[PDB]
């Protein structure tokens, strides 16, 4: 047991002692949302507040290891500050994101990383129609702040935002919630820019 | 007195010189809540603010020592940053937790740790009926953010929330308050997932 701990502490030491992705060493980041609550819809400012889990997964060759060199350790948990993490950002927030959970990642021996922080986000949204049966529709894009699609490839596993944990007694009934990968190009330039577009339709309960 | 001090400093660096629990070396964490106040119930957003003490207890063999080697010291106080602590999280908060108390832990020579942070928590709660004799009911689950039951086992020493310090002049009187261990098994998967569910029934005083 103490041998297991010595193996793991040694493994973390070895790995923690990568400059981000490059055009030569590109990176795929998979994004998925779990929508927990629409807390608030402000029609005086056109801001809406969401609580969600943002699921992020990527894989680095520099984080690989053989279990047999480390007591058959296949994965470990570590503070998300001890490793490189991607700069995925909401593009139309109006307030700094608030983190509602620990920021701990799970690294597996094949180099893959999973990181799922809970967050409250205020973003630009006109809630007109929320007091109707058709409800209101709003959207927010997420994407890297400094990397094109050539260095960070963003992808989803499904276009369905997980609503299975949505708060049943929220002030707002959720009518749909989708997460669509968008690829954008500008005429000037060859490289693509990728975002994931979160679209939520909702109405007063 | 200088010798006792020197004993303590020696103990700590011997002690300060654990990577968290694993499937090989699981850990048991005991949770208890002392509910101090229901500050606020917002029916415009369905958020409610509780002030409470969260008692956390666990034990590590890497933290045990012989009192006679250290001048009959039985326990010591240390900063919660100086030791490992569990990642117990409210699962339905809507704001970052606010910490109302120093974050200092007591370690005892058997290796047991006790840590009691005072917190204010906003969480998802529909308080409809709080102005009725029946009152309102709200629940928030607590549990590890990255560990399964096989790595952290969550237990309570009772399912009764301590109300002996509840603010007697609160705007809301407590009708009942329970803390109940739950084991959840997922369709896909063998491991159990464990939470402590805080249920609170309350009404306007």
């Amino acid at each position: 047991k103490l041998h297991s701990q010595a193996n793991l502490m040694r493994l973390k030491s070895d790995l923690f002692n990568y400059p981000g992705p490059t055009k030569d060493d590109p990176l795929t980041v998979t994004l998925g949302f779990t929508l927990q609550d629409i807390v608030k819809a402000d029609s005086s400012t056109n801001e809406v507040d969401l609580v969600y889990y943002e699921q992020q997964r990527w894989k680095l060759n520099s984080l690989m290891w053989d279990p047999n060199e480390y007591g058959n350790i296949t994965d470990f948990r570590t503070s998300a500050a001890d490793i490189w993490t991607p700069d995925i950002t909401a593009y139309s927030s109006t307030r700094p994101v608030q983190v509602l959970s620990p920021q701990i990642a799970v690294v597996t021996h094949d180099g893959s990383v999973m990181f799922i922080p809970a967050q409250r986000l205020s973003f630009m949204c006109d809630p007109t129609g929320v007091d109707s049966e058709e409800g209101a529709t709003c959207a927010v894009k997420f994407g890297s702040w400094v990397y094109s699609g050539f260095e960070i490839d963003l992808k989803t596993d499904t276009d369905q935002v997980d609503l299975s944990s949505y708060y049943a007694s929220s002030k707002y009934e959720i009518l749909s919630a989708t997460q669509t990968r968008q690829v954008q190009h500008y005429s000037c330039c060859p490289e693509p820019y990728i975002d994931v577009n979160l679209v939520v339709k909702f109405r007063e309960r | 007195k200088l010798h006792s001090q020197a004993n303590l400093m020696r103990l700590k660096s011997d002690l300060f010189n654990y990577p968290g629990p694993t499937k090989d070396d699981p850990l048991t964490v005991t949770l208890g809540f002392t509910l101090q106040d229901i500050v606020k119930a917002d029916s415009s957003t369905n958020e409610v603010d509780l002030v409470y003490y969260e008692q956390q207890r666990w034990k590590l063999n890497s933290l045990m020592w012989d009192p006679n080697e250290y001048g009959n010291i039985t326990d010591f106080r240390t900063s919660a940053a100086d030791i490992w602590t569990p990642d117990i999280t409210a699962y339905s908060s809507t704001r970052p937790v606010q910490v109302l108390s120093p974050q200092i832990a007591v370690v005892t020579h058997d290796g047991s740790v006790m840590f009691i942070p005072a917190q204010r928590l906003s969480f998802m709660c529909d308080p409809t009926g709080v102005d009725s004799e029946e009152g309102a009911t709200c629940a928030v689950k607590f549990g590890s953010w990255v560990y399964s039951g096989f790595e952290i086992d969550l237990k309570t020493d009772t399912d009764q929330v301590d109300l002996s310090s509840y603010y007697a002049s609160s705007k809301y009187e407590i009708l009942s308050a329970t803390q109940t261990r739950q084991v959840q098994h997922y369709s896909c998967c063998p491991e159990p997932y464990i939470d402590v569910n805080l249920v609170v029934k309350f009404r306007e005083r």
Binding site: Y53, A118 | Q184, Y186, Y193
Partner: peptide
């Protein structure tokens, strides 16, 4: 299901 739970999801890259 499991993907809704962050502690479960993070243990199963297989399905989440």
């Amino acid at each position: 299901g499991c993907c809704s739970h962050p502690a479960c999801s993070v243990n199963h890259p297989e399905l989440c």
